[PDB]
Amino acid sequence: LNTAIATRVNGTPPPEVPIADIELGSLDFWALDDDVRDGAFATLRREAPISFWPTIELPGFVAGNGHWALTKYDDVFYASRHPDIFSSYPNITINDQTPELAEYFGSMIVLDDPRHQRLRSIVSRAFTPKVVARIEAAVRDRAHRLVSSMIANNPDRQADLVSELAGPLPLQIICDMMGIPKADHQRIFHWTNVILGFGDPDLATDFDEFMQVSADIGAYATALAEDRRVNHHDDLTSSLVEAEVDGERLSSREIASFFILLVVAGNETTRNAITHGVLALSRYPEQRDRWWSDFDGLAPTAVEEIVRWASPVVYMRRTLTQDIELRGTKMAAGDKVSLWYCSANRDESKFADPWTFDLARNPNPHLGFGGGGAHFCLGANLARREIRVAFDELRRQMPDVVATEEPARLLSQFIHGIKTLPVTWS
Ligand code: HEM
Ligand SMILES: CC(C)CCC[C@H](C)CCC[C@H](C)CCC[C@@H](C)CC(=O)O
Ligand SMILES: [Ca+2]
């Protein structure tokens, strides 16, 4: 299409990045383009598989102690499967948890079992493979309407993939599951965007705004919950207010935190898998060709490889409950430990040809949904289906859809985000 992005050779390894150029506790490092980032993690995996880092500043948050970065696959996996040692309390981002933040962000993702499991059971039936298989009809026609409207909205055949499809599809689905009405979708989207875009001047850099948005979304969850308290609807919000996770009902804060976890995770995750997928297809059109020629035959492995490639969630943090030594590095009880999924997903000792984007890759033990165990992504089956249906609807309405500019990238250490990706089609 000649308006298109330049092609790229598949299996191209990243630039050489000297260790002296790697500074994970600087925001400027997260600004560097993706190739240099991948290069920097390659250097770490080889020369400092476990290394220590001061935690990033950014206004209004509390950096506190630094963290031991696990950049190897086997260590990320080991840490995920040993939660007695690598605890999710008190926080799964690198910054210290505060009681003010805990009002909105003290959900089960920052708790250990047995309380974590008891909370998780409240909503987990809805995310089961049997059940996500049953909402294919809702997914399909949100996706189909979005691709149609992408076409109708754009006589020029020039659109932003992010706001026209990748963004609103996983948003509409999670809000529908929560029971959030249509008129509120956009406001919800703008809130989770600021929550998980903090540090990026296109999203927010003033902590006052972050606190306001948090309060607004917490206030919003509370009002919806209270509604559902009196009038059951058959949405996840009703399950939340009806639950006893205990022999006790959930507190306001527990409801607010659970609501915000679902909606943020639902809104700031699969949209990036989808946008990175389209970009990757734009760079490697042989891959686009193979998949379009055999959509259903290649879909299971295509969807996993888009997730491996995008690694939408860059890292999660844990905290040691006891001393432990790994790979010859002694770490102490109370130390922060960060699990770099984006690095595990390029690990030369687990993946042949880690730099090759291969929609037929089989097996594909990636850690895009984390390393397995107690906090395994609750939305994994939902996300896979969202991804599959989105590309299915593109393949059938605009099969040659293709990026026309490099993406505007989210400045973020936690989320491999794309803010906008101009695409074209014929
Ligand atoms: C490609 C899309 C997605 C990716 C890559 C992803 C990634 C992750 C990762 C890395 C974790 C932490 C896992 C661990 O600690 O071992 C997680 C947890 C979680 N995710 Fe997903 N996520 C995605 C989509 C979604 C969706 C659509 C939802 C729907 C609400 C969702 C809901 C959750 C929840 C609730 C948790 C916490 C589970 C728990 O603490 O037990 N995710 N996700
Ligand atoms: C599956 C994933 C994407 C769900 C994560 C959802 C929950 C709501 C994460 C909490 C987000 C926190 C409060 C944002 C702060 C991160 C940042 C400021 C850390 C730092 O200072 O370096
Ligand atoms: Ca347009």
- Which residue's alpha carbon is nearest to atom 37 within ligand 1? 109
Q: Residue of the nearest CA to atom 41 in ligand 1?
A: 375
Verify whether ligand 2 is closer than 6 Å to residue 200 (CB atom).
Answer: no
Q: Closest Cα to atom 21, ligand 2: which residue? A: 95
Query: From the alpha carbon of 199, which atom of ligand 2 is closest?
Result: 18
Q: Is the CB of 127 under 6 A from ligand 2?
A: no
**What is residue 338's DSSP assignment?**
E
The answer to the question of whether 377 is labelled as a binding residue is yes
Is beta strand 67-70 parallel, antiparallel or unpaired with respect to 336-340?
parallel
Evaluated on CA atoms 275, 199, 196, 356, the torsion sign reads: positive
Q: Is 329 helix (H, G, I), strand (E, B) or coil?
A: strand
Q: Technique behind this structure?
A: X-ray
**Cα distance between residue 113 and residue 116, in whole Å:** 5
Resolution of this deposited model, Å: 2.1
| Ligand 1 centroid to residue 380 C-alpha, Å | 7
Ligand 1 centroid, distance to 109 Cα (angstroms): 9
The tokens of 200 are what? 């990026």
Give the environment of ion ligand 3: residues with CB less than 5 A: 154, 156, 158
CA of 423 to the centre of ligand 3 (A): 9
Q: Reply yes or no on domain 1-426 having CATH 3.30.70.20.
A: no
Q: Roughly what angle, to the nearest 10 degrees, separates helices 380-397 and 285-293? A: 90
101 burial type by CB count under 10 A (0-12 exposed, 13-18 middle, 19+ buried): buried
3-state secondary structure of 86: strand
Of 369, 376, 387, the residue with max ligand 1 atoms within 8 A of its CB, to mutate for a pocket test, comes to 369
Cα 382 from chain centre: 13
Q: State how far the Cα of 355 lies from the Cα of 346, in Å rounded to an integer.
A: 7
- DSSP classification of residue 160: E
